[PDB]
Design a protein around this ligand. Sequence first.
Ligand SMILES: *[C@@H]1O[C@H](CO)[C@@H](O[C@@H]2O[C@H](CO)[C@@H](O)[C@H](O)[C@H]2NC(C)=O)[C@H](O)[C@H]1NC(C)=O
Ligand SMILES: *[C@@H]1O[C@H](CO)[C@@H](O[C@@H]2O[C@H](CO)[C@@H](O)[C@H](O)[C@H]2NC(C)=O)[C@H](O)[C@H]1NC(C)=O
Ligand SMILES: *[C@@H]1O[C@H](CO)[C@@H](O[C@@H]2O[C@H](CO)[C@@H](O)[C@H](O)[C@H]2NC(C)=O)[C@H](O)[C@H]1NC(C)=O
Ligand SMILES: *[C@@H]1O[C@H](CO)[C@@H](O[C@@H]2O[C@H](CO)[C@@H](O)[C@H](O)[C@H]2NC(C)=O)[C@H](O)[C@H]1NC(C)=O
Ligand code: NAG
Ligand code: NAG
Ligand code: NAG
Ligand code: NAG
Ligand code: NAG
Ligand code: NAG
Ligand code: NAG
Ligand code: NAG
Ligand code: NAG
Ligand code: NAG
Ligand code: NAG
Lengths: 656, 194, 194
Amino acid sequence: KIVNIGAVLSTRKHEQMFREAVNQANKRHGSWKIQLNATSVTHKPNAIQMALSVCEDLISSQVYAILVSHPPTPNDHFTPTPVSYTAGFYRIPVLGLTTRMSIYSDKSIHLSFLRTVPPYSHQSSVWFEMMRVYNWNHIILLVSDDHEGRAAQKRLETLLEERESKAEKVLQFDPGTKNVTALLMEARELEARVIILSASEDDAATVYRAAAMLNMTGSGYVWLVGEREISGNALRYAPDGIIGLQLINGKNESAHISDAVGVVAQAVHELLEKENITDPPRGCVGNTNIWKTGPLFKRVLMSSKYADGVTGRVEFNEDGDRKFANYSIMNLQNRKLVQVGIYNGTHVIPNDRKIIWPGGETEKPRGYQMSTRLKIVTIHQEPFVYVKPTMSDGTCKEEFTVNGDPVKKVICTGPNDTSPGSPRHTVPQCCYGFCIDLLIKLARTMNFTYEVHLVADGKFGTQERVNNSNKKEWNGMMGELLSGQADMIVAPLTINNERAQYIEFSKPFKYQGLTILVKKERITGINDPRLRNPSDKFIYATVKQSSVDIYFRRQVELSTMYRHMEKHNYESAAEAIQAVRDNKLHAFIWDSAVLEFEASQKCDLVTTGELFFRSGFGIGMRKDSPWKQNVSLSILKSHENGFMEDLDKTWVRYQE
Amino acid sequence: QNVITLDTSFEDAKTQVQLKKIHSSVILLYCSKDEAVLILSEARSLGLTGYDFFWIVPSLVSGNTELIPKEFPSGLISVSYDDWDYSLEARVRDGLGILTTAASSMLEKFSYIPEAKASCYGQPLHTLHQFMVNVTWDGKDLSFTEEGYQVHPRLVVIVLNKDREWEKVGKWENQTLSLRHAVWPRYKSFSDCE
Amino acid sequence: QNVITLDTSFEDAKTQVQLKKIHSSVILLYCSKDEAVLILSEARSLGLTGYDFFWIVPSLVSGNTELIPKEFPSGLISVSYDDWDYSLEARVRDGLGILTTAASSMLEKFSYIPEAKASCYGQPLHTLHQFMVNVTWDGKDLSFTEEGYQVHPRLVVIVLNKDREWEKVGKWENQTLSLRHAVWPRYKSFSDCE
Ligand SMILES: *[C@@H]1O[C@H](CO)[C@@H](O[C@@H]2O[C@H](CO)[C@@H](O)[C@H](O)[C@H]2NC(C)=O)[C@H](O)[C@H]1NC(C)=O
Ligand SMILES: *[C@@H]1O[C@H](CO)[C@@H](O[C@@H]2O[C@H](CO)[C@@H](O)[C@H](O)[C@H]2NC(C)=O)[C@H](O)[C@H]1NC(C)=O
Ligand SMILES: *[C@@H]1O[C@H](CO)[C@@H](O[C@@H]2O[C@H](CO)[C@@H](O)[C@H](O)[C@H]2NC(C)=O)[C@H](O)[C@H]1NC(C)=O
Ligand SMILES: *[C@@H]1O[C@H](CO)[C@@H](O[C@@H]2O[C@H](CO)[C@@H](O)[C@H](O)[C@H]2NC(C)=O)[C@H](O)[C@H]1NC(C)=O
Ligand SMILES: *[C@@H]1O[C@H](CO)[C@@H](O)[C@H](O)[C@H]1NC(C)=O
Ligand SMILES: *[C@@H]1O[C@H](CO)[C@@H](O)[C@H](O)[C@H]1NC(C)=O
Ligand SMILES: *[C@@H]1O[C@H](CO)[C@@H](O)[C@H](O)[C@H]1NC(C)=O
Ligand SMILES: *[C@@H]1O[C@H](CO)[C@@H](O)[C@H](O)[C@H]1NC(C)=O
Ligand SMILES: *[C@@H]1O[C@H](CO)[C@@H](O)[C@H](O)[C@H]1NC(C)=O
Ligand SMILES: *[C@@H]1O[C@H](CO)[C@@H](O)[C@H](O)[C@H]1NC(C)=O
Ligand SMILES: *[C@@H]1O[C@H](CO)[C@@H](O)[C@H](O)[C@H]1NC(C)=O
Ligand SMILES: *[C@@H]1O[C@H](CO)[C@@H](O)[C@H](O)[C@H]1NC(C)=O
Ligand SMILES: *[C@@H]1O[C@H](CO)[C@@H](O)[C@H](O)[C@H]1NC(C)=O
Ligand SMILES: *[C@@H]1O[C@H](CO)[C@@H](O)[C@H](O)[C@H]1NC(C)=O
Ligand SMILES: *[C@@H]1O[C@H](CO)[C@@H](O)[C@H](O)[C@H]1NC(C)=O
């Protein structure tokens, strides 16, 4: 009765420590006839002969559990891989002791690998625990390493799924490149200042240099990294006040080997309690079959609970990782690594030392430096947003109304419609009218500046499917909203169901419905049954990728018109007005007050009598944001007085 | 409906509570072949194997075509890339076509591409790792992905009939499905108890 | 929705299909005691013991008020007549009153009213069976039907409270049902995990 245990080990002193741990494992574990034998191998510079030596030693040895504890002296990459693959061929368990790569967490590669150390991805758990201490909710994730950092990003999005509060922006790039300053500018432009990095040494030193070039060590900035960033040459160029994580006894090798041998020993003494016990044979002689109680012994190792340990209480999770590991939380007090906190698995306790921040005093960084400037996008709506080219040099002609009130114009930026069809300049331009003056009143109410720009292409924005993999995307003003290019859509935006699922809406400032523009012979709205089956004499359509398209796509009895007007959709409303003025159409489907304004302009343009889809123009907004309550309250304050009536007296009520 | 996982080898006490909430027709099951027999036996013991219901599994359980236990429901839909029309000879012919296409196309850029390692004892710019994307031999679009898979791979959609065997049903276009039978029958006889 | 029937002592295999047909709120249950325990344990396992899912059972399910068994949801509506107000002493006093009233009112019709059976070993017209259709003692309408029932008994509607007891809610008149709570009390914790 013997049990063979293999060990892949570095030194010669820890070989004696492994033999001493085998001797101590046979001390108090009963007078049973079982014994424990020790087998140790050393390094080779190339990994092929490492796997060759391991298989030639351990096929002849018939071991049960293999301990692998490679310290990376020449290279920090994938040295415990071959022993893991070799024993995972025969499904023999490998206990990794010094490696921490998250590629070992995926058991689709390593079928029979466990480890008594926690990987870097569970550091993200601590980073989630960094959010509950200071009540932080918006973070900026910068992942450098694409090898294992996607697993840490997935773990962070999994742990933030319980709060249902996503990160503000996640960024991924390639290790090795240096010029990553545009990523830093994208991290700059957002209101949050919490920066979370997981990287190797060299890319961390690169982004430390590039952040020192860009004032990112000042006040408000919060830097939160792991173990690989507080060492090497990255520690030489680390910004002061940084918060890092460190493994308590993570390189203490002797006690770690002893605790692993105790784990293996109690697993063996539990394995002898059961029957149907086999041995992994000499696999080099024609043995392609796996060891039959492989998953059984693996299930023993996964559910192996322990209360003994020199480092502490060791326990495996559902993925074979070290649970409830104590961490040190380190601060960099002017190029001095200072321990400022301890991490049990459920809670953080700081010590008597104070957490000196990267900025000025010891006050906590409320990392929401909210912007007084808001990116505003709108479309050229003729009764609402007049867009007109500048007079002399980027300036607007000061035009007066009928009462001598100066028209409050703004310097927006207007690109042309066809960028390859003509030399496209993207010149600034003048914006005024209804919604522009509403925005000027809103900026008059609350102290915030603004930058009005326009949409790249004249579409509101629809749920449009992209060609590869049939994936849904958004375009137009909503496509520029969700891409971060916009912050607040003040525009004639139609409220419906599909938009409010993704973005938020204020209370509507305009109440109107859909109606029909004709040339005057009665039509009498949508309830004319002859338009239900149209022909070449009923030529009518709507704006391409408008809200009318979605509203007619939902209602199934309006499908036939939806299968007609899809052949004649136009890019903008004014093109349809000019087409129906020359009698190239017969009707048009659009909102109420715009067509009433066009009827006030041109007497031949006639709106119909019926009315449907009584909805409201409101302000298109972002997600959870501090511009939800007071914007709606300011619109409602504009509704309770006669200011909306005065804006109607400017353009809506105004006849000609 | 909800996404139901497990914890351990089932006691049939609390995982049964997770299984009793299922009342919809189609069930996607993702588990190993050693687990799928027990899970489908628990589903059959709880009445989850009606002809109104449907069971679609990936290639994780559909391994050996010969090894079919009695607990597989007659009406199981699986997907595997094992094609009986393309044997091993056509596959190694396609592999040699990919290798010769990469060798003949990479030769047009730089000449001395093959540089093998000298020996396995005692330890490159132009590699085919970033050249394998644009390959087309004998009309077959055998292009590769960044994760190492195939862009247009050969899939096979099989069913389990009442004859307790696998029938090749669904073949594949460049992107979409081509069904041999647009009529989907009941496949009602799981056993005689229906 | 139509009446759900059970076949035999259930394996929780085929009757579960019948129980999954239920999408309504209130379910009426008419079975014996241990069958009610098994069906309510199944509905706990099926999640049919919710806030919207009400269960109204007769006195044949309950049996007695001094013994309240396990696996009853706290809010189980029962209709019985085992009341402490209509106590057992009052029960046997009313029974003696009915018997003496029948014997006295039949004594005015016929003289030799005591006519009993001799013995159980060794092997009638003026009987009390055809006489007490309309009998009344102490002003209580304790008349007897042809099928052996009280015409106007004391129907008591009880619920199971939050402390595993049966609280008296409703009493029943000759025509109306005198209730205590017009608004239905919730009894939110029918079980633990709700
Ligand atoms: C117990 O382990 C020892 C040490 O690994 C084994 O002794 C080795 O046996 C091999 C057999 O080929 C010899 O080549 C080595 O010289 C021995 N060890 C040394 C000095 O390196 C021993 O065989 C094992 N005994 C068993 C079977 O339990
Ligand atoms: C951490 O490194 C230290 C270096 O001293 C080690 O701890 C000691 O190890 C020796 C040899 O095993 C033991 O006799 C002592 O009991 C340990 N220190 C104490 C508690 O006095 C060890 O390699 C690592 N782990 C520990 C136990 O801290
Ligand atoms: C690490 O472990 C200790 C226990 O040793 C945890 O202390 C418990 O924490 C919870 C929540 O704060 C309390 O309700 C218990 O009363 C505590 N029990 C004891 C015995 O202390 C501690 O929370 C963990 N994390 C740290 C370091 O705070
Ligand atoms: C929205 O407007 C309200 C108007 O009351 C603002 O609330 C006040 O602002 C101060 C700012 O420090 C807050 O402390 C208080 O909640 C409010 N005043 C007091 C003393 O009651 C609110 O800040 C505005 N929110 C924004 C910025 O959109
Ligand atoms: C490369 O380096 C410069 C250095 O300032 C950086 O700003 C920029 O992002 C990169 N390319 C340029 C010159 O735009
Ligand atoms: C950093 O801050 C200063 C503030 O005066 C400003 O010149 C600029 O934003 C940055 N200049 C550098 C690169 O030091
Ligand atoms: C254990 O071994 C016995 C004897 O070889 C065998 O009969 C039995 O099948 C095994 N255990 C199981 C799978 O029940
Ligand atoms: C962490 O440290 C505390 C204090 O020494 C100890 O009680 C606890 O068991 C340790 N946990 C582990 C698993 O190291
Ligand atoms: C945009 O529009 C005009 C007319 O289409 C075009 O000539 C020019 O490229 C742009 N603006 C200027 C500079 O006129
Ligand atoms: C404008 O901002 C300043 C600085 O934050 C603040 O003092 C003031 O109250 C704000 N409101 C006004 C009056 O516009
Ligand atoms: C996808 O196809 C559409 C036409 O349906 C085309 O407009 C678009 O350019 C294609 N690709 C992209 C960039 O989505
Ligand atoms: C692949 O090479 C061929 C050569 O004709 C041609 O289709 C094209 O240049 C390449 N296409 C892709 C996908 O790179
Ligand atoms: C793939 O598309 C091409 C046309 O681009 C077509 O000739 C070919 O038949 C398609 N392949 C399949 C499998 O249908
Ligand atoms: C009671 O019932 C008897 C028949 O058994 C009937 O003759 C009598 O009229 C009834 N009592 C009343 C209400 O008078
Ligand atoms: C029914 O009810 C009363 C008792 O509440 C009873 O005395 C009488 O027989 C009946 N009266 C009516 C209202 O029918």
